Amino acid sequence: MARCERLRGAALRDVLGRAQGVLFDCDGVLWNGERAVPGAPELLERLARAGKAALFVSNNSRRARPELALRFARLGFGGLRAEQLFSSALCAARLLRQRLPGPPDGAVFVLGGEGLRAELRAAGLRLAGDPSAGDGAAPRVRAVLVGYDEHFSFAKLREACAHLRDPECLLVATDRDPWHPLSDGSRTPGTGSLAAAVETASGRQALVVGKPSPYMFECITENFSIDPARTLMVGDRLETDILFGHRCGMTTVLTLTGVSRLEEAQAYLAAGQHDLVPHYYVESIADLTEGL
Amino acid sequence: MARCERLRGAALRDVLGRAQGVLFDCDGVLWNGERAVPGAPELLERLARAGKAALFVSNNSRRARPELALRFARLGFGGLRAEQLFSSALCAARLLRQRLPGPPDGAVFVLGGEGLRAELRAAGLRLAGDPSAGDGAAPRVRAVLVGYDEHFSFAKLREACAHLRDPECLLVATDRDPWHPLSDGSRTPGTGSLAAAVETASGRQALVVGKPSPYMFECITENFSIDPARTLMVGDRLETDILFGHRCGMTTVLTLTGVSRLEEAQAYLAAGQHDLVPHYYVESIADLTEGL
Numbered sequence: 001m002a003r004c005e006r007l008r009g010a011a012l013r014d015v016l017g018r019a020q021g022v023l024f025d026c027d028g029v030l031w032n033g034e035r036a037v038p039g040a041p042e043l044l045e046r047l048a049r050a051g052k053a054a055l056f057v058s059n060n061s062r063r064a065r066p067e068l069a070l071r072f073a074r075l076g077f078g079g080l081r082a083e084q085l086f087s088s089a090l091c092a093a094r095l096l097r098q099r100l101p102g103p104p105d106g107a108v109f110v111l112g113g114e115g116l117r118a119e120l121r122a123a124g125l126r127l128a129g130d131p132s133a134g135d136g137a138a139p140r141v142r143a144v145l146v147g148y149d150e151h152f153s154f155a156k157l158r159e160a161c162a163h164l165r166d167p168e169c170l171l172v173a174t175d176r177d178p179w180h181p182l183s184d185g186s187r188t189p190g191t192g193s194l195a196a197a198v199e200t201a202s203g204r205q206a207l208v209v210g211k212p213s214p215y216m217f218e219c220i221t222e223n224f225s226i227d228p229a230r231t232l233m234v235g236d237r238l239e240t241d242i243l244f245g246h247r248c249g250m251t252t253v254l255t256l257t258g259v260s261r262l263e264e265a266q267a268y269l270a271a272g273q274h275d276l277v278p279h280y281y282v283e284s285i286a287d288l289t290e291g292l
Numbered sequence: 293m294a295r296c297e298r299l300r301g302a303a304l305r306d307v308l309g310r311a312q313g314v315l316f317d318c319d320g321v322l323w324n325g326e327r328a329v330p331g332a333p334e335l336l337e338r339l340a341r342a343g344k345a346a347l348f349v350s351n352n353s354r355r356a357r358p359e360l361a362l363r364f365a366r367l368g369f370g371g372l373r374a375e376q377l378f379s380s381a382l383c384a385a386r387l388l389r390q391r392l393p394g395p396p397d398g399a400v401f402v403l404g405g406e407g408l409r410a411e412l413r414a415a416g417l418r419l420a421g422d423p424s425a426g427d428g429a430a431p432r433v434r435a436v437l438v439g440y441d442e443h444f445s446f447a448k449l450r451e452a453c454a455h456l457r458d459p460e461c462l463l464v465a466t467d468r469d470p471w472h473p474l475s476d477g478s479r480t481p482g483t484g485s486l487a488a489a490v491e492t493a494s495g496r497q498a499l500v501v502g503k504p505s506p507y508m509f510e511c512i513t514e515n516f517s518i519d520p521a522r523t524l525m526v527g528d529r530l531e532t533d534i535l536f537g538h539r540c541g542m543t544t545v546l547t548l549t550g551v552s553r554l555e556e557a558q559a560y561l562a563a564g565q566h567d568l569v570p571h572y573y574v575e576s577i578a579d580l581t582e583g584l
């Protein structure tokens with residue numbers, strides 16, 4: 001099982017050689033804020049050359065796919081197809097298209113920003129507060145979606161609760177990341193904090209779209225035939241990316257350039273909490289390139 | 293132990309006769325919104341006549357003591373001394389006066405309304421955003437207090453987190469009630485929902501002031517010699533008032549005019565969760581009067 005081994009040498013050559021593809025978490029892995037992890041772009045270049053597939057999975061609900069694609073390019077990750085990029089915004093839009101109840105024969109009440117709303121509308125979803133048809137009633141709200149919402153308020157929370165009074169109204173969260181580190185050492189609250197407030201006030205459990213939910217893997221694999229037994233999952237958060245990998249049956253690699261510390265992985269290992277223990281770790285993903 | 297017995301007849305006469313005093317939760321017990329529970333005022337009148345002490349304990353952080361006292365009178369509860377009324381606002385102010393760290397050799401950042409702020413200032417506390425002395429630096433924030441905040445926002449959450457980056461900064465919540473029922477059947481989010489968001493984003497556990505924290509009982513008993521072995525605790529919420537009573541060693545009485553249902557108490561009893569099981573229940577507190 002996962003023993004949190006430092007991946008290097010012949011083992012690294014073996015692990016990467018056997019892998020048919022690599023699934024990358026983004027923040028803490030490819031970059032921190034506006035700074036690419038040195039050697040990250042070169043890894044992705046060498047992977048493409050090695051004939052190994054690369055896919056990208058982020059819990060970030062801020063950007064619709066077109067703006068996400070621009071961000072990869074800007075940070076040095078060139079030549080990527082938009083189809084290789086998966087975010088919790090995109091997959092939440094897809095989950096709601098697939099699951100929204102109501103007769104054919106709802107509207108979605110969204111706590112979140114314009115990039116999220118853009119992604120939802122692109123998937124064909126009607127949003128609460130979109131303008132109504134003629135002067136008829138507003139459509140019935142059949143899901144509440146909690147994403148990263150820099151305009152979160154008590155009034156919006158109260159309104160979310162009102163919608164959720166109907167037990168057939170879905171409650172969905174893009175992700176449960178509790179907070180994110182910023183470049184100056186400060187932190188921004190994460191969607192997990194807002195989801196906590198909504199779940200508490202409504203007495204509901206949210207359906208989570210993003211990592212570590214297996215749903216995210218369903219979203220990625222709708223379009224892509226990938227064998228999880230031959231896929232490496234690389235990420236910086238034990239409770240999100242490494243747990244995701246284990247749930248999906250992938251080999252997990254913790255990179256140490258982000259949120260989680262080696263000491264924490266080792267502590268979980270000691271406590272026998274194996275689903276929070278990576279199979280392997282690297283100081284940064286630049287350490288992988290040698291294995292090709 | 294607690295067996296959730298319907299309190300009536302000779303048993304009621306015995307229980308009330310032996311009691312030296314009664315501690316009442318307020319909402320769901322004495323009133324629902326602006327409507328007194330019929331017969332509640334008459335109970336309190338008869339209790340005073342029986343020579344039995346009455347004290348009142350509410351998690352409501354909206355009103356400072358003077359406005360709270362007006363509310364009791366208005367609902368039909370006359371003749372009360374302000375000293376008999378305890379709220380999570382009053383006791384949070386007291387806890388912070390007692391615990392605020394820093395040299396003699398802080399300020400308190402408050403998420404909450406004007407009644408809470410009034411209570412804190414009356415206890416001698418300086419509040420973040422109170423005006424600074426001359427043109428010197430703002431005082432160091434040494435506690436974050438989360439109360440009922442109808443103006444809660446993402447920006448305030450972010451700011452709470454910034455203060456909490458200092459591990460010596462306290463995190464205190466007035467209460468963890470998750471939501472409260474309104475007269476039209478709707479609900480308002482409770483402090484517990486906001487506390488959840490703050491704890492999640494900061495990765496901290498809050499110190500809770502109100503019920504079911506034993507601290508609330510310390511607050512009430514600072515001024516009042518009451519024997520918990522001779523005190524009845526009467527409330528409508530299993531996870532708040534009944535748990536509080538058990539933690540304090542009081543005889544607990546669930547009234548059925550509020551949040552918790554008899555069926556839920558019986559379910560907990562069945563599951564052997566005795567600290568969430570009331571010793572006794574009544575349809576409403578008006579059922580107690582006969583026992584005098």
Ligand SMILES: Cc1ncc(COP(=O)(O)O)c(C=O)c1O
Pocket residue numbers: 025026027028057058059060061062148177180190191
């Ligand atoms: C709101 C939000 N969600 C998620 C993340 C990053 O997600 P991931 O680490 O899954 O790429 C960030 C990082 O910027 C963020 O700002």
Ligand SMILES: Cc1ncc(COP(=O)(O)O)c(C=O)c1O
Pocket residue numbers: 317318319320349350351352353354440469472482483
């Ligand atoms: C914000 C808030 N806190 C607490 C409560 C009631 O508290 P309790 O049931 O402890 O009296 C209410 C009920 O109105 C409320 O509005």
Ligand SMILES: [Ca+2]
Pocket residue numbers: 025026027028029235236237258
């Ligand atoms: Ca990450």
Ligand SMILES: [Ca+2]
Pocket residue numbers: 256260261262263
């Ligand atoms: Ca480390």
Ligand SMILES: [Ca+2]
Pocket residue numbers: 317318319320321527528529550
């Ligand atoms: Ca109550």
Ligand SMILES: [Ca+2]
Pocket residue numbers: 548552553554555
């Ligand atoms: Ca009942």
